Design an enzyme around this catalytic site. Structure first.
Site, PDB file in Angstrom:
ATOM      1  N   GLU A 198      22.792  30.378 -64.404  1.00  0.00           N
ATOM      2  CA  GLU A 198      21.684  29.772 -65.134  1.00  0.00           C
ATOM      3  C   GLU A 198      22.020  29.508 -66.603  1.00  0.00           C
ATOM      4  O   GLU A 198      21.363  30.052 -67.505  1.00  0.00           O
ATOM      5  CB  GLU A 198      20.436  30.634 -65.012  1.00  0.00           C
ATOM      6  N   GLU A 240      19.732  32.313 -55.575  1.00  0.00           N
ATOM      7  CA  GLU A 240      18.611  33.167 -55.946  1.00  0.00           C
ATOM      8  C   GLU A 240      17.334  32.617 -55.328  1.00  0.00           C
ATOM      9  O   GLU A 240      17.048  31.421 -55.451  1.00  0.00           O
ATOM     10  CB  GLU A 240      18.452  33.263 -57.469  1.00  0.00           C
TER      11      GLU A 240
END
Length: 478
Positions: free
Chosen positions: A198, A382
């Site tokens: 991320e 995720e």
């Protein structure tokens, strides 16, 4: 059913899981950011101590046994830069080719590796090796993540008004050294490599400058951080190297502004991946003009074809509305739901215990948009929700997995699903209050407790898909 040998597993971050029992690592910017008293009383961080956390650094074989019991066969583990190189690697010089500010080449050779070999923590390398061996000896899929927000103090020190864990030129040169170092010793162990987790969340929050222009030159430093890494890592590994990215199903306010949707998706994500796969940096140059900051080539083959796979993270959608020459996340829906209600969204859908509405159709939407643009191997790195009492996670897991199965059937080259997470963990600024685990952790006793949703994973992994008796949990809206 899912494809044969499909990867069902979990994702893990070093800062969020490792500490708790022994071997405290205080050498990260996030550690001091977590402990800063002013940040605690100003509600920037919760005040919880990450060194009182899961203890995955020592209890990993017992947590892996629980993943094995629920039929998992994959794991994404993040290596902490602070533990491998606790002291600065600036004294190790490397050949760096640049032009108008774009780092085009960082030559990491084997005389650099043995130079970095003297500064590395050989005991920290053996501990990560034991964790990775504990995964691969079970025949599981291993994905190493190099960077997961926490940075060594000699790279970034919040002491001396944001966290400041962005990337600059000096941070990139040191990162490629640490990236090539990991691929030198784990290039034959890691099935796939991820350079960063991320990064869009990092250069969005790492600075008080929320302007679009500065957001994209910050993204530029992260763009080169992977491109120059990928080159150095591929010298020692033959495995797919990609980027784990934060994603939400971007939608306009009631689908009235589809151009704004594609506007948001290009500013936040597709500018990144068009540079690292193709070299399109017209955004970076377009920004660099109104800044009076020097820019380089608009199409750079140093950046291009530097993505072998994409790690897709998804939790909720992201509804946006055009304001003035800008956009705003609509509060009450998506990730910003926890502002009008913590129990139901404006669409009348359930909300997570961290304020993110449950929108299972978005995991099909985000995977489709990624596939319809690039067509590479992908992975759900995720997916999960904050849910301590396991009120919604059973229906969350089934509904999202069937929307993802609808994506595999439609052509998406997704060969893995990594749930976030096997156990609860430190949710950064919110501390341990946000429990994402399929098993619950008592942070006082460090005991592991299986949640019922973890047994749902045991049933899905056993059948390689959702049996008919579990279809009621797969309903999208609840």
């Amino acid at each position: 059913m899912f494809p044969k040998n499909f990867k069902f597993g979990f994702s893990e971050a070093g800062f969020q899981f490792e500490m708790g029992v022994s071997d405290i690592d205080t050498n990260t910017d996030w550690y001091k950011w977590s402990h800063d008293s002013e940040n605690i009383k100003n509600h920037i961080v919760s005040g919880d101590r990450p060194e009182e956390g899961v203890g995955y650094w020592d209890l990993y074989p017992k947590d892996h046994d629980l993943a094995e019991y629920i039929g998992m066969n994959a794991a994404r583990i993040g290596i902490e830069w602070s533990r491998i190189f606790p002291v600065s690697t600036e004294r190790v010089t490397v050949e760096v080719i640049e032009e108008n500010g774009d780092i085009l080449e960082i030559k990491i050779t084997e005389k650099t590796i043995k130079e970095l070999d003297l500064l590395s923590d050989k005991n920290a390398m053996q501990h990560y090796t034991n964790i990775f061996n504990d995964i691969k000896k079970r025949g599981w899929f291993l994905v190493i993540n190099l960077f997961h927000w926490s940075l060594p103090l000699w790279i970034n020190d919040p002491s001396n008004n944001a966290l400041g864990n962005c990337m600059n030129r000096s941070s990139v040169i040191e990162f490629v050294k640490y990236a090539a170092y990991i691929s030198y010793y784990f290039g034959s162990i890691a099935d796939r490599f991820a350079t960063m987790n991320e990064p869009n969340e990092v250069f969005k929050t790492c600075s008080e400058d929320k302007r679009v222009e500065s957001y994209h030159i910050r993204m530029k430093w992260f763009v080169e951080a992977h491109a120059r890494s990928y080159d150095a890592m591929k010298q020692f590994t033959n495995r797919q190297i990609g980027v784990i990215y934060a994603n939400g199903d971007v939608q306009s306010f009631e689908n009235k502004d589809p151009k704004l949707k594609e506007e948001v998706e290009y500013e936040q994500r597709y500018s990144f991946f068009d540079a690292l796969i193709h070299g399109d940096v017209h955004w970076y140059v377009g920004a660099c003009r109104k800044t009076n900051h020097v820019h380089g080539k608009s199409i750079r083959p140093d950046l291009s074809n530097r993505i072998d796979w994409i790690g897709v993270n998804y939790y909720s959608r992201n509804v946006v509305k055009r304001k003035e020459d800008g956009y705003e996340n609509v509060r009450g829906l998506g990730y910003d739901t926890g502002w009008v209600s913590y129990e139901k969204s404006l669409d009348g859908r359930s909300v997570s215990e961290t304020g993110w509405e449950i929108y299972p159709e978005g995991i099909y939407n985000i995977v489709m948009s990624y596939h319809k643009r690039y067509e590479l191997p992908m992975m759900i790195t995720e997916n999960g929700m904050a849910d301590d009492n396991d009120r919604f996670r059973p229906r969350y897991l089934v509904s999202h997995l069937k929307n993802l199965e609808r994506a595999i059937n439609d052509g998406a080259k997704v060969d893995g699903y990594l749930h976030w997470a096997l156990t609860d963990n430190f949710e950064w600024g919110s501390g341990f209050s946000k429990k994402f685990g399929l098993i619950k952790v008592d942070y006082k006793t460090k005991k592991r407790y299986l949640r019922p949703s973890a047994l749902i994973m045991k049933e899905i992994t056993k059948h390689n898909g959702i049996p008919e008796e579990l279809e009621w949990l797969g309903e999208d809206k609840f």
